[PDB]
Amino acid sequence: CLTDLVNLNLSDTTEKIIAEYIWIGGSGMDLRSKARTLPGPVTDPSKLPKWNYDGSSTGQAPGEDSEVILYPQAIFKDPFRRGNNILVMCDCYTPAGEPIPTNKRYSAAKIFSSPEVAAEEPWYGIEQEYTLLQKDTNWPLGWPIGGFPGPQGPYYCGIGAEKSFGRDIVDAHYKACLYAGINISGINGEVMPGQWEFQVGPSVGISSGDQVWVARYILERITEIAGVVVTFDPKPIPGDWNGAGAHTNYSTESMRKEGGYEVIKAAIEKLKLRHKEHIAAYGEGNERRLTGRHETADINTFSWGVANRGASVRVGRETEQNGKGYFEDRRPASNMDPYVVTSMIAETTIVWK
Amino acid sequence: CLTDLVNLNLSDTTEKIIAEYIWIGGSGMDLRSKARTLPGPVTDPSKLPKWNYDGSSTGQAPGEDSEVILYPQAIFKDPFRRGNNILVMCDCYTPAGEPIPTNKRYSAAKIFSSPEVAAEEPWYGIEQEYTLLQKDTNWPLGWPIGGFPGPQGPYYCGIGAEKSFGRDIVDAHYKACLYAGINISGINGEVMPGQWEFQVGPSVGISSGDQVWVARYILERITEIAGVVVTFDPKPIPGDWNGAGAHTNYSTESMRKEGGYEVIKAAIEKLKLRHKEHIAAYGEGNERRLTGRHETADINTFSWGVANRGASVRVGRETEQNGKGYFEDRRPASNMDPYVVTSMIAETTIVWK
Amino acid sequence: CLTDLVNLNLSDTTEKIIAEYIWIGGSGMDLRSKARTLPGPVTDPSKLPKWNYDGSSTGQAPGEDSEVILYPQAIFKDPFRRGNNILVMCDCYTPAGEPIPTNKRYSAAKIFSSPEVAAEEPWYGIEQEYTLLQKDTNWPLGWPIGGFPGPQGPYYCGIGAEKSFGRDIVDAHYKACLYAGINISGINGEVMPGQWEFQVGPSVGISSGDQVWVARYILERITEIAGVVVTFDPKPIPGDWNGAGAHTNYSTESMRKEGGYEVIKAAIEKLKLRHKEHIAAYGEGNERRLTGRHETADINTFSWGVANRGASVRVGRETEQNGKGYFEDRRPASNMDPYVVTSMIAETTIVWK
Amino acid sequence: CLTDLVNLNLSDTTEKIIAEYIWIGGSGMDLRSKARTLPGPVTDPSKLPKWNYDGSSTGQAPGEDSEVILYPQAIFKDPFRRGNNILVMCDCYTPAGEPIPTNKRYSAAKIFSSPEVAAEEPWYGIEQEYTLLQKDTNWPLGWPIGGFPGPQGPYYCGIGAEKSFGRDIVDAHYKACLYAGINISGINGEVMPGQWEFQVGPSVGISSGDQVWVARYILERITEIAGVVVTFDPKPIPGDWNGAGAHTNYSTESMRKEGGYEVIKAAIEKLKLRHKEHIAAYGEGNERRLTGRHETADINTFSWGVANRGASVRVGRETEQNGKGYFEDRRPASNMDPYVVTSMIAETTIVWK
Amino acid sequence: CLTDLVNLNLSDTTEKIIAEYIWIGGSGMDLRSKARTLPGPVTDPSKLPKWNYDGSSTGQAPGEDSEVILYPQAIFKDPFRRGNNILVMCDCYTPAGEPIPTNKRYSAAKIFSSPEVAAEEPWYGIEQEYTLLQKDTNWPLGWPIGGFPGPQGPYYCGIGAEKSFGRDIVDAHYKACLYAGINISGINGEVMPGQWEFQVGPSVGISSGDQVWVARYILERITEIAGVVVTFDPKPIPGDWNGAGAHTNYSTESMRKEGGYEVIKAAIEKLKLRHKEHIAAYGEGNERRLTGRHETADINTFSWGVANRGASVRVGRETEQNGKGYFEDRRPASNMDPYVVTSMIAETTIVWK
Ligand SMILES: Nc1ncnc2c1ncn2C1O[C@H](COP(=O)(O)OP(=O)(O)NP(=O)(O)O)[C@@H](O)[C@H]1O
Ligand SMILES: Nc1ncnc2c1ncn2C1O[C@H](COP(=O)(O)OP(=O)(O)NP(=O)(O)O)[C@@H](O)[C@H]1O
Ligand SMILES: Nc1ncnc2c1ncn2C1O[C@H](COP(=O)(O)OP(=O)(O)NP(=O)(O)O)[C@@H](O)[C@H]1O
Ligand SMILES: Nc1ncnc2c1ncn2C1O[C@H](COP(=O)(O)OP(=O)(O)NP(=O)(O)O)[C@@H](O)[C@H]1O
Ligand SMILES: Nc1ncnc2c1ncn2C1O[C@H](COP(=O)(O)OP(=O)(O)NP(=O)(O)O)[C@@H](O)[C@H]1O
Ligand SMILES: C[S@](=N)(=O)CC[C@H](N)C(=O)O
Ligand SMILES: C[S@](=N)(=O)CC[C@H](N)C(=O)O
Ligand SMILES: C[S@](=N)(=O)CC[C@H](N)C(=O)O
Ligand SMILES: C[S@](=N)(=O)CC[C@H](N)C(=O)O
Ligand SMILES: C[S@](=N)(=O)CC[C@H](N)C(=O)O
Ligand SMILES: [Mn+2]
Ligand SMILES: [Mn+2]
Ligand SMILES: [Mn+2]
Ligand SMILES: [Mn+2]
Ligand SMILES: [Mn+2]
Ligand SMILES: [Mn+2]
Ligand SMILES: [Mn+2]
Ligand SMILES: [Mn+2]
Ligand SMILES: [Mn+2]
Ligand SMILES: [Mn+2]
Ligand SMILES: [Mn+2]
Ligand SMILES: [Mn+2]
Ligand SMILES: [Mn+2]
Ligand SMILES: [Mn+2]
Ligand SMILES: [Mn+2]
């Protein structure tokens, strides 16, 4: 019957391809997509046609001048439609060729193009945390309605029906992402029951932001299948339960070479000065998360330590002892725009003095 | 839809591998795991990177010094993720290289390294019993809520919908373990309805403890899928129902060779003297199990017989008549740490006088 | 998820094998099994190890002398575990090598070994009837609770959702048995709604008993999957509903050769004389079945006819007209031990005068 | 239909009466009752017939000598049967006239008979706490199954559907008790959601124990109607939730007269010396309750303060400022026998030196 | 059965009375009560005993100094317990006789005692709006879960099953209050489906605050019976749905006499100057309600008109045309403390210049 049709192999019948054009919508936090048929397979982003959508239905243009243009930027294999079908990550422009206010990729692209950044060859691994919720009631997966599970403790990395809610979704997403070609580096159960993580493994410049959005798209499409809701809300349940962040790990050419640990301290130092204006772009709602409790640092203070999860920045035991590595900015909230955060770290770290 | 993604074959798309790093957490009875992407297949434990986790969320380190280090010790095939993906059993260390208080494998490794033990080449077959429970109500599987099934009798090794609860889970685990490469030697329905057994077949020294933990990991992960809870609690329901033990069967080089039956009696003799201090490590809650009824021996007396299930140690009809074999220490409870019990039998049996 | 693991092909991964050792327990009507791993495939019964079980949990030995020994007698392919895995039918012995009181195969083995029996080469086809029940309520499958279906008539060999309850189970069992290598000759819907039949086709001497037990094992294991209960109770519902019997068909070398119909009458004649002592072994509860109504003969009278289903023995139209064939002893109840009935017919028929 | 019969007025039809004889059973914590028809109304306990019950079904006598005798001690009006029908509180004796081991009223009666006690005229007000549970799952009323409500805080004396579970029962019991003639002094919602209190107001000597038992009888009979379970277990849920005590408030003639506050301290002083042996009779399971947290004092220390709920004994602000009053022994657990606790306080306080 | 006991008439049996002492707790927004038995009826507040509660469980005192004292201030008939039983509204004091920080009645009592205020004889009518919610899901009554009803419009003062949710509760509360003796002036369905109103009719000085609290207590106790939740939250659902306010109508001796309309303008004028510091006490969350839309005035502007529901203060058509009357301060939110608002209007209106 129904999954027989969803999983039809089109390769046996024509050469035609399905391309799913993904973009970011008016809120800057809402993913949108639609699909077109293309005459044959494509591997190069710049050999795909540009397209348009109804900007008036995503809060990005008026009705009388409704067209917004889609620039194909990255191609990944579609894990849902399979065969030769593709997901295409997109950029948003007016018909005049201006990037619209909600296109944060443009500005970020410029920074990673800029030659003294590109030469430093920045690397990001970003750890996406998220919470799963029951549809309609909007209460965390596996929690009883109008009630709570046992207190935090057994949940982090746990196993068992009483401890681990929705591995299904998680394990599915992991494979999906790998197949798609997203550089996904790992997953893990998080502290708060119903909370989970994936990390998009060391990825260079713009492609980090690109991957992280497409990873999010795949996540939510998977939840959709499961009849479950995701939030990227930084602190979804108030009280004695963990919030969710998008820890960004970072390194430059000079940082992973000999005596990079001095360049690390130097970088952290710059970050301290601009804490104020980084917090401002590190995602909204963050005040509710960064409280100094629950493995976060207070929004108002800046700090850094070695194995310290109470800090604003953390530098692994391993990269300290090796005099070379990366550091982890724990400040960005789960609803961070990776384009914004990713480039603004490279900016406050290389260009500015 | 959803199982189509969980069961994707990655072999068709990249060389990459998923490694699921397993460890033991702060309670010493709670398994934890998380997963990372590795660039290609691996068969040798010492060719896998060491890793870390958040010790502060497993009750094994403070927040300000949170890192705990993972030493890959054994590799098995992942029966869930399949293809070339692996489970990796692990060991727990401070960044300074000290084994943390809860790492009972280190001490046990030392004893099986020690040359007069290694030479005796000890063999353990351990019989894990466990009980299956309904999620939330926490009442045994196939029992009616706030009520009991018929009295014990038809359940041991039984068959039929009224006698045999959750064979699904059991049969699955058997194959999983075998596929994984765990030396699993057999299974059986236990005396108490909803109680089951598997034996991790004759395995040498450290690898016994390693296999038994990974087998337990796989059991619980399977129950997770079924939406059922496991306990290793030695006596889960009070009254006229069997408890659960982790009988350890044991033999040395000299015990399975000609006239080993004398070395057996000699061993049992030593064991009687140290009963007090063995009971102390044979798992907590045991007082509720070892009552002398229900095929156990009273906690306070030590005994041993031939075909005697009422005894503290038992020696099979078969190994008596053959003047060579193994004996069965029935004392350890189902929530025994096999590292502790497995090495402490070799210790009280070979080294001490 | 779960059936992916139950159905794993182990052939791709090791040579190892799962052997499911089946025996008969304390009541003489309760099947029991457990499984062990064996190092490679096996086709010869006498190349399988002997094993033991806990006789104290099946009511076959005391706790202090608990071991009972298992002698591998027949091998069949496991239809559940598939691949190279096997079911092993067993025999029950004390550690001294005595057959325990409940081992009726030993005695029957002796009779079919005895040379003037073996030479007559006896043949049994036995027709197992059985009734399917809802779990917990214990009321016949497809019957409304605390109520009855339409009166008997449309059910025998019927088809359709209102007439035919649990064909699923039946059809499954048929293939299962065939695959296993049981000589199964046919199946049919019985007269009472929810009642069914299979026949273990012409099988020689001991192997008849052996097959019929293993057929029953496979039946119940299948109902277990379906969450349904079986009874072999000869009259499960009182009143105007059919009971269940285990009709034994029988023939010797001389009976199927020319003018065997005289040897048949001669046999029937002997059977009439020992009706009293045959009824005594033809299974308990039989008084409730054999009432002279519902295609049975009264327990107290012995009779025989040609196409007569009201008779104690029946001789087909076909084997009458051919002067050679078999006859059908309709007296054994569905909970008959085939070892006892099968050998005792050969005994009262050949040896005794 | 059914409540029309339960509530029939018998006064319109005969003079006859129903007496419900209540006693305490073998565990010393289980109430039992049965009813007899008496020819007319009765107000004097000593004009009621003595009766017997089956001591062998309450664990209080062997089968061959099964009779145990019931002595009517107190009469109350039956709030369930209403009209002229009565509850009768009872005392338990052998046919020889010996009080059986589980009759703690006999001993307590002697102490309140004793003239130097009777003259001091002791007064007890006892505050019974208890917890209401869902039938079968045995989880607290208003809690979600396998989960918890919001943390403690809004529940104590609260109102509202989300805060206040089973007022129905509580309010019913209150009126019931008053109607019955139990001197009930007040009720209140307790700290732990689903936990409640009533106080049996200042009552003299023996009649305190008598009223508290009949009060408990009425409580449970009311829950029975509601299909809800009661526990008097001192700490029914482990962790961060209140236990349940039976605070006993106490005063003597001299304590409520001028400068009784000196006699109070003097009494407290004596109580400190016998803390050890009082804890031994203050009900079993108490170790789990008295932890020093949750408004209790640690089992091992004795303390006392003025407005201090963390203490072993507490003396109200009001009775300090007035130089005369009562004090509150907070040590007895909810499953205290009031006969034992009530007399033993008068004993350690008046007779002993 | 159960409502037979809840509704027992105690008047037939003793003279005793149940008094339900009501107070306000630690949040200043949470009502608490408990009940005591009193020896006979009472009509005069100052003939009731003072009482205490556990301040440590309402967040009003530490554990070691836990006692807080209850001053009976007003008596009403208990509509739940009926007969001669009473609700007692209370005041909160330390044992030293200080009013605790959360006792806003003390300060308000002083202001209405003050002779130039008492002489002006102030009158309040306060209109309590509130929203009804489903237990556990916490979604408005009669709304579908994770969805909305038809847009606002048919709901205000409506009738019918699709328009009018929980009239049951409202109508019941109306009678309850009247019976109790609360001067309740009227009720009405509010604009937002599931939202309701009652007005506590012209009441003088302190007794306004007293009645409004007791009214709220009765409301929530009724919802408790219905298994429904109340919120006094000023804007319980975001978006295009009405918030809830506690409009205070107000008049002085001089304002309802000839040419009071000048004293009204004069009063309004004073209120405009102190708008800033009135908003500060008019209840928390108010920023979310007072938006200028949905019949409110913006928090930051002060305004007033005649028939104007968009204004901060409104003066009826009727009292304008009569040159004498009252005005309506629409600024206070539904979670207003009437003690605070009620006195502070009298203060900013009479005493201050
Ligand atoms: N040289 C590098 N520069 C920047 N990021 C890197 C580098 N090497 C690795 N990363 C990674 O960025 C990541 C950080 O991984 P993670 O496994 O989440 O540890 P974590 O900081 O302990 N997280 P958490 O428990 O969520 O607080 C992964 O994608 C790593 O692959
Ligand atoms: N030489 C040996 N030394 C130690 N253990 C062995 C040896 N040979 C076999 N074992 C085994 O250890 C096991 C014991 O199996 P098992 O039959 O379940 O014990 P049991 O006494 O029968 N059980 P129970 O029903 O739990 O009381 C399996 O792994 C056997 O393979
Ligand atoms: N020579 C033979 N000796 C013994 N049994 C035989 C012989 N030939 C055939 N059988 C059979 O034994 C069987 C008897 O089958 P069956 O047809 O079910 O009995 P029935 O009288 O026909 N029917 P019922 O009304 O269902 O009780 C099958 O295995 C037949 O193949
Ligand atoms: N002279 C007295 N001697 C003994 N008990 C008395 C005396 N006078 C009153 N009591 C009382 O004993 C009681 C104690 O009631 P209670 O209201 O619960 O005080 P509490 O210590 O505040 N309780 P809690 O919240 O459980 O800690 C009632 O029956 C009081 O009437
Ligand atoms: N002199 C007065 N001083 C104060 N309040 C008064 C006075 N006279 C009457 N009230 C009243 O205070 C009230 C205000 O009630 P209400 O009739 O609902 O006003 P409303 O402005 O129509 N309501 P709304 O739809 O909520 O905006 C009632 O109790 C009136 O009887
Ligand atoms: C557990 S952790 N990921 O190491 C700490 C992160 C945490 N979930 C947070 O962002 O608040
Ligand atoms: C039946 S048995 N496995 O021989 C005895 C083991 C039993 N379940 C126990 O109490 O340990
Ligand atoms: C229909 S039939 N198989 O010929 C008769 C068998 C019947 N159920 C019996 O109990 O003998
Ligand atoms: C409010 S209270 N009765 O003072 C608290 C007492 C608590 N339930 C106890 O464990 O004794
Ligand atoms: C009908 S009405 N009271 O004028 C509307 C008032 C509205 N519920 C408010 O936000 O105050
Ligand atoms: Mn991480
Ligand atoms: Mn994390
Ligand atoms: Mn991190
Ligand atoms: Mn075993
Ligand atoms: Mn076992
Ligand atoms: Mn064993
Ligand atoms: Mn047949
Ligand atoms: Mn048949
Ligand atoms: Mn037949
Ligand atoms: Mn109290
Ligand atoms: Mn209390
Ligand atoms: Mn108390
Ligand atoms: Mn109004
Ligand atoms: Mn209104
Ligand atoms: Mn109004």
Residue from E166, E160, E172, E158 nearest E141 by CA: E166
Interchain contact, D150 vs A145, CB within 8 Å: no
Give the distance, in angstroms, between the CA of residue E309 and the centroid of all CA atoms in the same chain: 21
Interchain contact, B160 vs C1, CB within 8 Å: no
What gap in Å lies between CA B119 and CA B97, rounded to an integer? 28
Question: What would the CATH number be for the domain defined by D1-101?
Answer: 3.10.20.70
Phi, psi of C252 (to 5 degrees): -110, 160
What gap in Å lies between CA D48 and CA D21, rounded to an integer? 11
D295 lines ligand 9 (CB under 6 A): yes
Resolution in angstroms, to 1 decimal, for this deposition? 3.5
Residue from C134, C129, C249, C137 nearest C192 by CA: C129
* Closest approach atom of ligand 4 to CA D247: 26
Determine the Cα angle at B342 with ends B341 and B347, to 5°.
90
CB atoms within 10 A of CB E149: 18
Residue in D77, D161, D226 closest to E223 by CB: D161
Chains that touch A (3 or more CB pairs under 8 A): B, D, E
Contacts of A149 (CB under 8 A, 6+ apart): A142, A143, A193, D146, D147, D148
What gap in Å lies between CA A247 and CA C118, rounded to an integer? 82
Q: How many helices (H) and strands (E) does chain E have?
A: 10, 13
Helix axis angle, E206-226 relative to E104-113, nearest 10°?
140
For A225, half-sphere exposure in the C-beta direction (CA atoms, 13 angstrom radius) is 21
Method used to determine the 3D structure:
X-ray
Give the distance, in angstroms, between the CA of residue E213 and the centroid of all CA atoms in the same chain: 5
Q: Residue A93 corresponds to which tokens in the numbers above?
A: 């422009």
Which single residue is written with the structure tokens 């077949």?
B201
Taking CA atoms, what residue in D is nearest to B145?
D136
Residue C68 C-alpha, separation from nearest chain B C-alpha, in angstroms: 9
Helix axis angle, C206-226 relative to C104-113, nearest 10°?
140
B195 lines ligand 2 (CB under 6 A): no
* Cβ(E177)–Cβ(E184) below 8 Å: yes
* Cβ(C190)–Cβ(C184) below 8 Å: no
| Gyration radius (Cα) of chain B, Å | 21
Beta bridge partners of D274: none
Contacts of D191 (CB under 8 A, 6+ apart): D152, D155, D156, D242, D294, D295, E57
Burial class (CB in 10 A: 0-12, 13-18, 19+), A308: buried
Residue E96 C-alpha, separation from nearest chain A C-alpha, in angstroms: 35
What gap in Å lies between CA E296 and CA E273, rounded to an integer? 19
D309 lines ligand 9 (CB under 6 A): yes
In order of B65, E105, E134, E304, E345, the CA distances from E224 in angstroms are: 49, 26, 11, 39, 33
What secondary structure, in 3-state letters, does D134-169 show?
ECCCCCECCCCCCCECCCCCCCCCCCCCCCCCCHHH
* Cβ(D84)–Cβ(D41) below 8 Å: yes
Q: Quick check: do D and C touch, 3+ CB pairs under 8 A?
A: no
For A173, half-sphere exposure in the C-beta direction (CA atoms, 13 angstrom radius) is 32
Q: Quick check: do B and E touch, 3+ CB pairs under 8 A?
A: no
* Cβ(B313)–Cβ(B329) below 8 Å: yes
D131 lines ligand 9 (CB under 6 A): no
| Gyration radius (Cα) of chain E, Å | 21
Residues of B in contact with A189 (CB under 8 A): 34
Residue from D191, D198, D190 nearest D171 by CA: D198
What gap in Å lies between CA C62 and CA C69, rounded to an integer? 14
What gap in Å lies between CA C127 and CA C249, rounded to an integer? 8
Interchain contact, D172 vs E5, CB within 8 Å: yes
Determine the Cα angle at D137 with ends D132 and D140, to 5°.
25
Q: Residue C215 corresponds to which tokens in the numbers above?
A: 């057929």
What gap in Å lies between CA B291 and CA B288, rounded to an integer? 7
CB atoms within 10 A of CB E249: 22
Tell which of C15, C60, C66 to mutate to test the B interface (max B CBs under 10 Å): C66
Q: What is the length of chain B? A: 353
What's the maximum distance between 2 C-alpha atoms anywhere in chain E?
63
Q: Long-range CB contacts (< 8 A, 24+ apart) of D298-305?
A: D302/D271, D302/D272, D302/D275, D304/D268, D304/D272, D305/E64
Tell me the CA end-to-end span of chain D in Å, nearest whole number. Answer: 63
Give the distance, in angstroms, between the CA of residue C96 and the centroid of all CA atoms in the same chain: 29
What is the b/e burial string over E47-73, where b = at least 16 CB atoms within 10 angstroms of the residue's CB? Answer: ebeebbbbbbbbebbebebbbbbbbbb
* Closest approach atom of ligand 1 to CA A200: 29
Q: Residue C135 corresponds to which tokens in the numbers above?
A: 């779990």
E131 lines ligand 10 (CB under 6 A): no
Amino acid at E7: N
Q: Which helix (H) or strand (E) holds A178?
A: helix A167-180
Interchain contact, B13 vs A309, CB within 8 Å: no
Which single residue is written with the structure tokens 């989960």?
D147
Strands (E), chain D: 17-24, 31-38, 51-54, 67-77, 86-93, 123-134, 184-189, 195-204, 228-231, 246-251, 304-305, 313-314, 327-329
Taking CA atoms, what residue in B is nearest to C3?
B172
Residue in D172, D226, D308 closest to E66 by CB: D308
* Closest approach atom of ligand 3 to CA C314: 21
Chain E positions contacting chain A at CB under 8 Å are: 135-138, 145-147
Phi, psi of A172 (to 5 degrees): -60, -50
Interchain contact, E53 vs D307, CB within 8 Å: no
Tell me if residue C191 falls in helix, strand or coil.
coil
Residues of D in contact with B133 (CB under 8 A): none
Residue E290 C-alpha, separation from nearest chain A C-alpha, in angstroms: 23
Report the separation in Å between the CA atom of B138 and the middle of ligand 7, taken as the mean of its atom positions.
22
What gap in Å lies between CA D285 and CA D238, rounded to an integer? 12
| Beta strand C327-329 pairing with D51-54 | unpaired
| Gyration radius (Cα) of chain C, Å | 21
Interchain contact, C52 vs B172, CB within 8 Å: no
CB atoms within 10 A of CB A57: 13
* DSSP code string of E221-240: HHHHHHTEEEE--SSSS-SS
Report the separation in Å between the CA atom of C58 and the middle of ligand 19, taken as the mean of its atom positions.
33
* Closest approach atom of ligand 1 to CA A249: 5
CATH topology of domain B102-353: Creatine Kinase; Chain A, domain 2 (3.30.590)
D231 lines ligand 4 (CB under 6 A): no
Tell which of E2, E3, E8, E57 to mutate to test the D interface (max D CBs under 10 Å): E57
Report the separation in Å between the CA atom of B314 and the middle of ligand 16, taken as the mean of its atom positions.
8
* Cβ(C77)–Cβ(C87) below 8 Å: yes
Amino acid at E213: W
Tell which of D159, D182, D211 to mutate to test the E interface (max E CBs under 10 Å): D159
* Closest approach atom of ligand 8 to CA C129: 8
What gap in Å lies between CA A92 and CA A76, rounded to an integer? 18
Q: Per-domain residue ranges for chain B?
A: 1-101, 102-353
| Beta strand E195-204 pairing with D67-77 | unpaired
Residue in A188, A306, A310 closest to B63 by CB: A310
| Beta strand D184-189 pairing with A304-305 | unpaired
Contacts of E264 (CB under 8 A, 6+ apart): E255, E315, E319, E325, E327
* Cβ(C172)–Cβ(C187) below 8 Å: no
Interchain contact, C5 vs B222, CB within 8 Å: yes
Q: What is the length of chain C? A: 353
Q: Residue E143 corresponds to which tokens in the numbers above?
A: 């709304």
What gap in Å lies between CA E215 and CA E223, rounded to an integer? 13
Taking CA atoms, what residue in D is nearest to A143?
D147
* Closest approach atom of ligand 7 to CA B294: 10
* Cβ(B119)–Cβ(B111) below 8 Å: no
Residue from B26, B205, B18 nearest B100 by CA: B26
Tell me the CA end-to-end span of chain A in Å, nearest whole number. Answer: 63
Q: Residue E227 corresponds to which tokens in the numbers above?
A: 């298994």
Torsion of CA C68, C74, C77, C78, to 10 degrees: -30
Phi, psi of D107 (to 5 degrees): -55, -45
H helical segments located in A181-260: 206-226, 253-256
What gap in Å lies between CA A287 and CA E337, rounded to an integer? 29
What gap in Å lies between CA E60 and CA E67, rounded to an integer? 9
Amino acid at A91: D
Determine the Cα angle at C214 with ends C210 and C217, to 5°.
150
Which single residue is written with the structure tokens 């060729």?
A97
Residue A143 C-alpha, separation from nearest chain E C-alpha, in angstroms: 12
Residue in D147, D239, D240 closest to A147 by CB: D147
What gap in Å lies between CA B178 and CA B187, rounded to an integer? 12
Chains that touch D (3 or more CB pairs under 8 A): A, B, E
Report the separation in Å between the CA atom of C315 and the middle of ligand 17, taken as the mean of its atom positions.
13
Q: Residue C138 corresponds to which tokens in the numbers above?
A: 């214990």
For D277, half-sphere exposure in the C-beta direction (CA atoms, 13 angstrom radius) is 8
Residue from C250, C271, C242 nearest C315 by CA: C250
Taking CA atoms, what residue in B is nearest to C96?
B317
Contacts of E57 (CB under 8 A, 6+ apart): D153, D156, D157, D191, D295
Tell which of B134, B135, B137, B143 to mutate to test the D interface (max D CBs under 10 Å): B137
Tell me which DSSP letter residue A33 carries: E
Report the separation in Å between the CA atom of A324 and the middle of ligand 6, taken as the mean of its atom positions.
24
H helical segments located in E152-260: 167-180, 206-226, 253-256
Interchain contact, A158 vs B52, CB within 8 Å: no
Q: Residue E81 corresponds to which tokens in the numbers above?
A: 């317990």
Closest residue by CA, ligand 2 atom 11? B125
In order of A7, A8, B13, the CA distances from A82 in angstroms are: 8, 9, 12
